[PDB]
Structures are given as C-alpha cells and as structure tokens.
Amino acid sequence: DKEFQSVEEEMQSTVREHRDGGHAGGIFNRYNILKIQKVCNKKLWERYTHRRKEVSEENHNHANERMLFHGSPFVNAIIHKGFDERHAYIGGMFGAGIYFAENSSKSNQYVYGIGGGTGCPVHKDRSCYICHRQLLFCRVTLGKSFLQFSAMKMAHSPPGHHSVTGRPSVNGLALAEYVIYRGEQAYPEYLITYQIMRP
Ligand SMILES: C[C@@]1(c2nc3cccc(C(N)=O)c3[nH]2)CCCN1
Ligand SMILES: [Zn+2]
Numbered sequence: 001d002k003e004f005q006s007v008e009e010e011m012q013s014t015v016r017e018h019r020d021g022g023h024a025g026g027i028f029n030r031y032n033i034l035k036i037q038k039v040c041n042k043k044l045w046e047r048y049t050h051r052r053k054e055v056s057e058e059n060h061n062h063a064n065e066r067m068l069f070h071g072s073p074f075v076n077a078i079i080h081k082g083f084d085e086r087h088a089y090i091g092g093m094f095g096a097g098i099y100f101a102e103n104s105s106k107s108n109q110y111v112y113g114i115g116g117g118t119g120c121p122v123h124k125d126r127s128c129y130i131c132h133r134q135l136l137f138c139r140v141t142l143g144k145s146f147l148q149f150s151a152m153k154m155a156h157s158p159p160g161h162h163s164v165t166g167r168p169s170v171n172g173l174a175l176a177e178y179v180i181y182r183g184e185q186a187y188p189e190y191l192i193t194y195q196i197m198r199p
Helices: 001-015 042-057 075-081 106-109
Strands: 031-038 065-070 098-100 133-141 147-149 162-165 177-180 186-196
Touching: 001 031, 001 133, 001 186, 042 133, 042 186, 065 098, 065 186, 075 106, 075 186, 098 147, 106 133, 133 147, 133 177
Parallel strands: 147 162
Antiparallel strands: 031 186, 065 133, 098 177, 133 186, 162 177
C-alpha cells in the first residue's frame, strides 16, 4: 500500500548523522524495513480521540497533531496498554514526560534503553545489524506546545500548555524532541520492524 510506502519514506528520509558518532543507536545511513503493521486498538484510539478533542477545544479548535517516532524496549506493552506517564521519571531533559522525535534515527537510539543500553539481547551490540528492532510511528497531540531550548525538569505540561517542544540550540539539542505528560495524548499507530544497515 501507498500508506506503508509513506511510513517507510518518513523512516528513511529523517535519518541524521548523530553527534555521539553512532554510540547509542549504531552506525548506519539507512534501514532495512522488514514489516509495517497498523495498530488497531479501539480502546486506545478512543482514549486518544477523546483527549485530542479536549486539547483542540483548549487550543483555538486545533489539536496540533503530528506523526512522530518513539523508540522503547517496551513497544509491546505500549501497543496493548498505551503510553503511560506513570512510567516516566523526572530525570529526563524535560522531566517526567513521554518523548518523541521527528527523526527516526533519534528514536532508534532508545530502542534498547537509555543511550542504547547494552544493545541487542542476543549479541549485546548497540550497532547490531542482525537483530530486528522495533520503532513506533505515532499520532501525537501537541496542542499549545511550550517552546524550550535548555533543560527544564517538569512533572507536567507548563501552565496553559499541552506539551513541550525541545528546539535545537548551541550547547544545546542537535535535533528537535516533543514531550507529552499524559499518556492519552499519543496513539501508537504503526509498529515498524527493521534493521539498521551497515554503511
Ligand atoms: C532519554 C529519554 C528520551 N529522549 C528522547 C528524545 C526523542 C525521542 C525519544 C524516544 N523514546 O523515541 C527519547 N527518549 C527517555 C526518557 C527520558 N528522555
Ligand atoms: Zn544482535
């Protein structure tokens, strides 16, 4: 389908060269996309659309929805139970939120844990070209997004806002990131199974 070619194109075209020289996510310029599955979870979709309507009403009739990537070792729990802010902690750059990227390669750095953890379960390699990885391509409601450049450890969205946008700066994020503080503000629409490819 054209729908899945659109997802593959977003995955491939948003890859960037990372500052860590590939330490966290591995060394690659492209992926080998193995499978793209649309997630159809009615209960999660209804939780998402209900919140999206509330946010839209609080943001001049505009949800400010974006399709963004999410990398996590807990993708299977997310598809079944949804995103859950109770699993987020204050330590992150923008505090206790759920983080998303517009660059697939940035989310890929989080698939095996913080900073890529110890890499794949079988070879303990953050740059494994063999093991199949999974990323989510999500529908995210940003609403009135608070624009921020430096670390700001929050527990919740800033007053009057529905999310935080981390914007690139000098010392300094390299790439954007988007943070929500309510799990119902995102829907895990596509599950992408892939490998990073050796350059
Ligand atoms: C390190 C962490 C993180 N930062 C991100 C920025 C953009 C995307 C993601 C993602 N999961 O795809 C990120 N995850 C996890 C919790 C504290 N912040
Ligand atoms: Zn491996």
